[PDB]
């Protein structure tokens, strides 16, 4: 049953979207605002006032104090807008490259495994965004490995902190330790923790 | 006297084509030339394939010159914000061997 | 003076001036001769203007802008001083102004 | 306790959102080892060069920096229709 209107012009709308993505900073947040609204309208996740970070009664325990302070330093208060934004960021296009909100963790205390876990969960809940920021999280993980596993760390980093896939798909590790910057995300380089090459 | 003189008698005579003793401004007052990559000013080259004479090499005054200038997008000396992050433990801080 | 050309009523002066400007060895110009966009931001930064100004001041002003441009330190380098003045293993972040 | 609410509900929300009209990019292929975003520019012989994806640092929009601690409220400070008398449309 025909509708008297013009066909949705795919080839043109995609073009205008690219021109906008080039020239219009607002575009990202325009698109996010739809996705975010949708998350909110699906009523899928809501904050509660009841936190659940620790088993009873580990918070009371005096031996747990360093661990508990670690968790409390990581665990943010729930806010619907921020949660929805995360779920929406997962699907929204990225134009300005994302960066990690840098941790300063030194990984001396055992409790610091919390930060590693903070990433693992992020890699699970948000694999897309994770992949956007993973070099920046490799910089934290390296401080983790050089303390917890200094020998293996030396072998790894001796292989190279990054690699570049070439023709025919072979990896080519740099052989050179060097801190990642998000400048590299648009380059040929990859964080080497994620090479999954034994 | 009047070593400082650049122009004289900016009028025209009604008989002779230029007034006796009238002086035109020197060409160097008007050669903007170029800012050399080094940042020194230069007079325009007098011929093809010649670099221009640096303006400070010679004693003529030049009154049009290229001045580099920073724009609105630059800014210098503005105070800048940072996130300080203190160490989690004083006893975890190695001082040496560095 | 180069501006007087075809504006001064004084004939010989306009003739002498036109004569100097029509030489190959000299060429007046006034305005935005040069531009230098940032490599990342793609916005303009250091622009060269042909001002009416003595070559000495232009030389000095360019010496200054050159010292500031060619040093290759930024506001972020201030962090290196803050580390010296804060406890060992204190971290500093942002904003990478470049 | 929280997983069914993710897998059996939130995943569907992702699958739909993925087909929304404005989600035009390929954000990820599921392989961290090899995925690299496709990179386009508006560009002319006259010399204009506008990358679609640029690295510009934090922006006024606030979408650029990522606080990964957002993971915590989710695991331990959020209800869901599937997880939580327990019937809920």
């Amino acid at each position: 049953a025909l509708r008297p209107e013009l066909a949705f012009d795919h080839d043109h709308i995609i073009r205008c979207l690219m021109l906008a993505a080039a020239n219009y900073p607002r575009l990202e947040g325009i698109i996010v605002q739809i996705n975010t609204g949708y998350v909110a309208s699906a009523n899928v996740i809501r904050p509660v006032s009841e936190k659940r970070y620790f088993p009873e009664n580990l918070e009371q325990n005096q031996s747990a104090a360093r661990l508990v302070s670690a968790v409390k330093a990581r665990a943010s208060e729930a806010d619907i807008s921020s949660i929805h934004l995360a779920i929406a960021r997962e699907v929204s296009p990225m134009f300005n490259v994302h960066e990690l909100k840098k941790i300063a963790e030194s990984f001396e205390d055992p409790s610091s495994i919390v930060v590693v876990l903070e990433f693992i969960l992020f890699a699970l809940f948000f694999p897309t965004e994770f992949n956007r920021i993973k070099g920046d999280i490799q910089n934290v993980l390296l401080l983790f490995f050089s303390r917890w596993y200094p020998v293996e760390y030396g072998i790894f980093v001796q292989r190279g902190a990054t690699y570049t896939i070439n023709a025919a798909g072979e990896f080519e590790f740099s052989g050179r330790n060097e801190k990642w910057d998000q400048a590299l995300y648009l380059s040929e380089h990859f964080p080497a923790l994620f090479s999954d090459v034994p | 006297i009047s070593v400082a003189r650049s122009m004289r008698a900016i009028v025209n005579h009604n008989e002779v084509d230029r007034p006796r003793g009238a002086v035109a401004p020197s060409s160097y007052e008007m050669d903007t030339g170029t800012l050399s990559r080094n940042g020194d000013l230069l007079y325009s080259p007098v011929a093809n394939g010649q670099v221009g004479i640096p303006k400070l090499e010679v004693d003529h005054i030049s009154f049009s010159n290229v001045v580099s200038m920073m724009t609105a997008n630059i800014r210098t000396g503005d105070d800048m914000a940072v996130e300080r992050v203190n160490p989690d433990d004083v006893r975890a801080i190695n001082i040496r061997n560095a | 003076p180069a501006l007087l050309r075809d504006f001064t009523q004084v004939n010989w002066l306009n003739r002498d001036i036109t004569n100097m400007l029509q030489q190959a060895g000299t060429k007046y110009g006034l305005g935005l001769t040069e531009t230098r966009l940032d490599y990342v931001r793609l916005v303009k930064t250091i622009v060269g203007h042909a001002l009416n100004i003595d070559h000495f001041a232009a030389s000095v002003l360019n010496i200054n802008l050159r010292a500031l441009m060619e040093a290759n330190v930024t506001a972020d380098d201030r962090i290196k001083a803050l580390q010296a003045h804060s406890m060992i293993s204190t971290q500093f972040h942002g904003p990478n102004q470049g | 306790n929280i997983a069914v609410a993710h897998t059996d509900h939130l995943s569907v929300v992702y699958a739909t959102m993925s087909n929304f009209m404005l989600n035009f990019t390929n954000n990820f292929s599921g392989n961290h080892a090899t995925f690299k975003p496709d990179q386009y520019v508006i560009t002319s012989p006259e010399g204009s060069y506008k990358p679609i994806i640029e690295r510009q640092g934090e922006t006024v929009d606030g979408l650029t920096i990522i606080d990964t601690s957002i993971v915590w409220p989710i695991l331990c400070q959020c209800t869901y229709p599937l997880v939580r008398s327990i019937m809920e449309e």
Binding site: - | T76, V82 | A75, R78, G94 | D67
Partner: peptide, 15 residues
């Protein structure tokens, strides 16, 4: 403590 996607600035450095 609270989620904040921006850099959490606290100090200033004068030139």
């Amino acid at each position: 403590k609270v989620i904040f996607n921006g850099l959490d600035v606290n100090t200033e450095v004068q030139p």
